Amino acid sequence: GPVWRKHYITYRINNYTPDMNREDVDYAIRKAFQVWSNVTPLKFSKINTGMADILVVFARGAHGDDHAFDGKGGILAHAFGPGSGIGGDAHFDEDEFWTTHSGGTNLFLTAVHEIGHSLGLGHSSDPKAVMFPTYKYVDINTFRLSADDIRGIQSLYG
Ligand SMILES: [Ca+2]
Ligand SMILES: [Ca+2]
Ligand SMILES: [Ca+2]
Ligand SMILES: [Zn+2]
Ligand SMILES: [Zn+2]
């Protein structure tokens, strides 16, 4: 599968969910990128204008790709693997209620998973792994990447 062939990667937050404080969206997304830069040679920088590698979008229903959202529940988000244009982009379903905590759907935890896809990871069959296909809340303040996820990403980078 495709991988980024460079170490400096940019992201841009296209728009913000009204579910959360602006600064909390920024922080959740920043921390999610950090999870992966911790275990690879990758560096992530937020840009406010122009073409980023990874565009972060909040949208509902049909939103201009082959991955229409399905209302509250079900599919929470999706992302494209490394590549030009839409490649790398991560989309979050606005019909979910995004939060900083255990209520609603945790943005940070969801973003860690989707960014995994943005970097070229597939799914894991291990329920402990963040790349498990289905969402589950774990304490965000003590979150640690599982051994399986580390193995997965280190097969692609570093
Ligand atoms: Ca949904
Ligand atoms: Ca892109
Ligand atoms: Ca929402
Ligand atoms: Zn989409
Ligand atoms: Zn997934």
Side-chain angles (χ1 to χ4, degrees), residues 142-157:
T142 59
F143 178 85
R144 287 194 60 180
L145 260 192
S146 75
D148 187 79
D149 294 308
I150 292 175
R151 290 271 217 282
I153 199 74
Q154 291 186 158
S155 76
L156 300 173
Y157 304 94

Side-chain angles (χ1 to χ4, degrees), residues 63 65 78 91:
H63 61 276
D65 61 22
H78 78 98
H91 300 170

Side-chain angles (χ1 to χ4, degrees), residues 11 19 21 64 80 85 93 98 101 106 137 142 153:
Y11 71 95
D19 302 348
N21 303 316
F80 298 99
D93 191 351
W98 301 102
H101 53 265
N106 190 269
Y137 180 83
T142 59
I153 199 74

Side-chain angles (χ1 to χ4, degrees), residues 77-112:
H78 78 98
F80 298 99
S84 58
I86 57 92
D89 296 359
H91 300 170
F92 297 81
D93 191 351
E94 192 58 79
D95 285 331
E96 315 314 331
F97 185 67
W98 301 102
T99 85
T100 59
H101 53 265
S102 67
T105 305
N106 190 269
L107 180 59
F108 163 79
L109 290 173
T110 302
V112 173

Side-chain angles (χ1 to χ4, degrees), residues 16-147:
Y16 287 81
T17 174
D19 302 348
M20 288 175 65
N21 303 316
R22 297 288 190 275
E23 71 203 319
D24 292 340
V25 175
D26 285 346
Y27 193 67
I29 295 303
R30 175 183 177 84
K31 288 297 269 68
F33 278 110
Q34 288 173 2
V35 165
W36 300 111
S37 59
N38 283 348
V39 292
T40 66
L42 298 167
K43 292 296 265 195
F44 299 104
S45 301
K46 181 172 175 284
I47 70 172
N48 295 143
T49 186
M51 187 181 286
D53 297 306
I54 297 168
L55 191 65
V56 172
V57 181
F58 292 89
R60 46 168 46 88
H63 61 276
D65 61 22
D66 277 344
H67 302 264
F69 286 134
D70 57 354
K72 182 175 157 61
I75 301 294
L76 308 172
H78 78 98
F80 298 99
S84 58
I86 57 92
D89 296 359
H91 300 170
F92 297 81
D93 191 351
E94 192 58 79
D95 285 331
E96 315 314 331
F97 185 67
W98 301 102
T99 85
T100 59
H101 53 265
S102 67
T105 305
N106 190 269
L107 180 59
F108 163 79
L109 290 173
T110 302
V112 173
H113 178 103
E114 306 314 331
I115 293 163
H117 289 311
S118 298
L119 305 180
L121 291 177
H123 283 150
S124 174
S125 55
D126 187 347
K128 298 186 194 287
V130 80
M131 297 311 303
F132 193 67
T134 328
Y135 169 86
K136 183 168 180 61
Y137 180 83
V138 297
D139 194 317
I140 55 159
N141 310 284
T142 59
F143 178 85
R144 287 194 60 180
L145 260 192
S146 75

